């Protein structure tokens, strides 16, 4: 299978750009990361920082995850992110999203060796 770390990178990492520019970033990103493949993935966040800076969150502020595990970490700094959320009228297979650029702290679950993000828990 794809590893959990790899899946996180496919779903949540966009180190290419410092922000979302065109307000159909989400439409194109969601498609190219295979998140509109079988259905429209309703919500998804992209992080626009280096992979090194993102992996480093795994040694920052330890917090509970939503599921109640305690291997989650909150970034000390705000990060450049894009919140993609499907529109009220979107219907597969013509998936429609709005793009919201923001600077927020991320919370990720970390696991494995090397100890890297395996789950995007939230932005705050």
UniProtKB/Swiss-Prot annotation:
Q: What is its EC number?
A: 4.6.1.18
Tissue specificity comment: Pancreas.
Encoding gene per record = RNASE1
What is the protein's quaternary organization?
A: Interacts with and forms tight 1:1 complexes with RNH1. Dimerization of two such complexes may occur. Interaction with RNH1 inhibits this protein. Monomer.
Molecular function terms from GO? lyase activity; nucleic acid binding; ribonuclease A activity; RNA nuclease activity
Q: Write out the catalytic residues in the record.
A: 12, 119
Q: Which family does it belong to?
A: Belongs to the pancreatic ribonuclease family.
Print the keywords alphabetically: Disulfide bond, Endonuclease, Glycation, Glycoprotein, Hydrolase, Lyase, Nuclease, Secreted, Signal
Annotated S-S bridges: 26-84, 40-95, 58-110, 65-72
Which GO cellular component term is one of those annotated? Answer: extracellular region
Q: Which reaction does it catalyse?
A: an [RNA] containing cytidine + H2O = an [RNA]-3'-cytidine-3'-phosphate + a 5'-hydroxy-ribonucleotide-3'-[RNA]; an [RNA] containing uridine + H2O = an [RNA]-3'-uridine-3'-phosphate + a 5'-hydroxy-ribonucleotide-3'-[RNA]
Report the protein's function: Endonuclease that catalyzes the cleavage of RNA on the 3' side of pyrimidine nucleotides. Acts on single-stranded and double-stranded RNA.
Residue intervals passing through the bilayer: none
This chain's source organism reads Bos taurus (Bovine)
Chain positions recorded as substrate binding sites: 7, 10, 41-45, 66, 85
Nuclease as UniProt keyword: yes
Localization = Secreted
Give the source's domain of life in one word: Eukaryota
Segment of the intact protein contained:
27 to 150 of 150
> Where is this chain glycosylated?
1, 7, 34, 37, 41
Name the chain's protein.
Ribonuclease pancreatic
Tell me if Repressor is a UniProt keyword of this record. no
- Its GO biological process terms? defense response to Gram-positive bacterium
